Paper text:
Leukotriene A4 hydrolase (LTA4H) is a zinc metalloenzyme that stands out with unique dual functionalities that include peptidase activity in addition to lipid metabolism. As an epoxide hydrolase (EH), LTA4H converts leukotriene A4 (LTA4) to leukotriene B4 (LTB4). As an aminopeptidase (AP), LTA4H hydrolyzes natural ligands such as dynorphin, enkephalin, and the tripeptide proline-glycine-proline (PGP), of which PGP has garnered significant interest. Therefore, bi-functional EH and AP activities undergird the intricate pro- and anti-inflammatory regulation, respectively, exerted by LTA4H.
As shown in the M1 metallopeptidase HEXXH-(X)18E motif, the Zn2+ ion was coordinated with H295, E296 H299, and the carboxylic acid side chain oxygen atom of E31826. Our interpretation is that the Q136 side chain maintains the catalytic water molecule interaction with E296 while simultaneously engaging in multiple hydrophobic interactions via its rotational freedom. The loss of water molecules could afford more favorable binding entropies for nonpolar ligand binding, provided steric clashes are avoided. Also, the structural data suggest that nonpolar ligands are likely necessary for enhancing the peptidase activity due to more favorable binding entropies in the active site.
Residue numbers in the entry: 3 to 610
Write the structure that this text describes.
Amino acid sequence: IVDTCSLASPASVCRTKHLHLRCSVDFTRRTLTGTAALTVQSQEDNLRSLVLDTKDLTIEKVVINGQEVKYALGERQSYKGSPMEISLPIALSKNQEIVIEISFETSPKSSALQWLTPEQTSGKEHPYLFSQCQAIHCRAILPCQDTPSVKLTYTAEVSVPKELVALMSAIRDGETPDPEDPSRKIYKFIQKVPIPCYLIALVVGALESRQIGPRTLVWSEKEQVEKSAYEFSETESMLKIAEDLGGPYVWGQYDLLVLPPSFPYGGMENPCLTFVTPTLLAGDKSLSNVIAHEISHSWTGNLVTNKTWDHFWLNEGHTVYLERHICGRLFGEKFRHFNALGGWGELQNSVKTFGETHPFTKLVVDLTDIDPDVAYSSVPYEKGFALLFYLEQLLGGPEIFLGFLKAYVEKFSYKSITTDDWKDFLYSYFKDKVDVLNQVDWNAWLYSPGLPPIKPNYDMTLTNACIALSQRWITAKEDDLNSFNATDLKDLSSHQLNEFLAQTLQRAPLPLGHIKRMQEVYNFNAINNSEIRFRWLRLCIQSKWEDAIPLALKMATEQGRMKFTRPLFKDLAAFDKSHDQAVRTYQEHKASMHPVTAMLVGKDLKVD
Ligand SMILES: COc1ccc(Cc2ccccc2)cc1
Ligand SMILES: [Zn+2]
């Protein structure tokens, strides 16, 4: 197996067993300066040199056995960064190990980091830093074998201003005043469980905590600590359910971190410290499905990981499957089917957006000369789940397939696998149903673009109310607009209301009078629920309602979740009345946007 996203030496040549990170965080220069001690094991005889992944890194020196050795940075290869060859002071035999201390310093243009000014935070007093290494941004923080095929434990000592707090994707290991600087603190961290390097995370800021479980603290600025602790109160309940589905939780502590609005994703599953968007603070725990998702990743993604990014569906596909199983335990089987069916609708949207023949709509992709951030979508999430949901109904139901999953997690625990690894074990587990498995169009499910060859069976109980009301609006005439009222939503949950907008959005645009009437009777402008508002504003913009232009521009910039920001900007760019505003608003905010988010929105707006 070849990782076409990495320029480092493959796992067949050498493997990094441990990392010791000793660095200091300079907010004045916006740089990370320190040393990275990599314990590397040779996988072949007579190993004299190895290559590492770097990206906008400044290398001072390389120390092995107390003496400096010769190193060389090759030319940059765009998004992959610059390869770093290191000359070993001794030829290594197989399984032989050495420790390599690399003195490095990050660039302010680190694609893995976003530096926030005090004004960009809640407290307005202190600066802020958070990392995002998924998929291949860890090289922009430190020199490494930036590949998920290599797992590694790590320890870290991080120096930050004494009035600030540092947190990493590891177990907290005490804090002390910096002996070299009285104005700073040193936070120590330890990760005893081997992780892929993309799971390395760091956050520095005026953070506070509040315990909500025996092994869970919620971290954020003081302004959001209390709201977050309430919003995520179901965390421990979800952990207990997840443990019952995938086996014991092996990370010891599961803390949550609520980041500033510019956090690119809904959630990052960093071990011991899950990163989440503040747009989950709906006030009624209604977006806690994301928490169940990130929790589930502790088994599918963190324990059994994809060997390359071509098999990324292994991570999210199974994780969504566990996620919706957790919500199934909490709110019933009909609720699980509700989210499952809605997820198919999301798959419909992604395929239609890319194209029926677009390579990014394949379950297993080919990221050769392809920036992973560009290819990222809901396809591996939903098509992956669609396959597993299809296999569930095909092999005897949920209880039986949940048996496979637990065996699957235990079989490939602490290991990196491929799709064929998964498929072979599937046939191995269900050996008495190989005739059933052979009826599966594997080539279409795994390697063919567009919608899956077959649609799973979904319960329609909670969805019927959505379809009924949406069809009313879509097929509505002018003398049907008056009969609409606020009573139409009396028996609709927040999820049903959101699905209603999702269904209606698929047939956008609607007549402008329909949308105006909809605001008059439903008052959707008053809803702060990010998911509901996002689809409501998209419906308005696509239906050419100029009144929603400042509202869409506001939400697109007051938060940075690419799930919301990117479709909002594109819709605003497709609307002639707001095209100039959209491009201008982007240009005025791009310097302060997340580096990855700023790049992608630029491509979407075609202002690159
Ligand atoms: C969340 O950060 C990322 C970005 C990109 C990838 C790679 C990928 C994307 C889509 C389909 C298959 C593989 C993985 C993680
Ligand atoms: Zn995920």
